[PDB]
Design a protein around this ligand. Structure first.
Ligand SMILES: N=C(N)c1ccc(/C=N/NC(=O)c2cccnc2)cc1
Ligand SMILES: [Ca+2]
Length: 223
């Protein structure tokens, strides 16, 4: 997260870190057994780390639980990043408490202008490289579909939205991939892509979660 702020330990209780020997992506806990992330985060040997603040220090609220299965969206295209969404099932159910909690799925899509909270452990620099140890947060508005398409001609599908600031300086970044965009207590987005980070006229692009609620629910119901 570039141009954000320190969230505060366990203030974003649905935020997970995906670990394969090191943090490599974020995710969102949606019930005791399931995490939503980006399909471009797919790999084998995932351990889900819940209750994290400093990802390099055991601070006392963590739950580390291996993934038992991952399900990439059937229509995910890794070239265009269309349908950039994946479900991960935990080998055992998380113990839910104030610091480890699920986030609600939307019942309707969010509109341009809605303020959302975007979070993760990704790069904090738009030029150089600096990875934080503690969870970073950014408050950002959803942008109109027209401004999103204008920023990225030929690249924005109906399964994507933009959020952030056309002026630049404030954005998600590499390492935030797969993490949450939460608006009025609903998971509306997943950190998906952008051109660099926090560049002028290049806002963050996010998977449009409201399009996938039916798929998420039916997948969970049979797996
Ligand atoms: N500006 C954003 N909101 C943004 C931009 C990019 C990304 C994702 N990056 N992933 C990578 O580059 C990458 C991925 C694999 C290997 N090497 C590099 C997320 C958000
Ligand atoms: Ca920790």
């Amino acid at each position: 997260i570039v141009g954000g702020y320190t969230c505060g330990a366990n203030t974003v209780p649905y935020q997970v870190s995906l670990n394969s020997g090191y943090h490599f992506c974020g995710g969102s806990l949606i019930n005791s057994q399931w995490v939503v992330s980006a399909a471009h985060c797919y790999k084998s040997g995932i351990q889900v780390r819940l209750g994290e603040d400093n990802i390099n220090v055991v601070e006392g609220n963590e739950q580390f639980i291996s993934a038992s299965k991952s399900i990439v969206h059937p229509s995910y295209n890794s070239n265009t990043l269309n349908n950039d969404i994946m479900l991960i099932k935990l080998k055992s159910a998380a113990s839910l408490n104030s610091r480890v909690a699920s986030i609600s799925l939307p019942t309707s899509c969010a509109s341009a202008g809605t303020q959302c909270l975007i979070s993760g452990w990704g790069n904090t620099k738009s030029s150089g490289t600096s990875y934080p140890d503690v969870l970073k947060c950014l408050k950002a508005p959803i942008l109109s579909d027209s401004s999103c398409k204008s920023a990225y001609p030929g690249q924005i599908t109906s399964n994507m939205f933009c959020a952030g600031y056309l002026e630049g300086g404030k954005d998600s970044c590499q390492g935030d991939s797969g993490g949450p965009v939460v608006c009025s207590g609903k998971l509306q987005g997943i950190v998906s892509w952008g051109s660099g980070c926090a560049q002028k006229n290049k806002p963050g692009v996010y998977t449009k979660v409201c399009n996938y609620v039916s798929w998420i629910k039916q997948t969970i119901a049979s797996n």
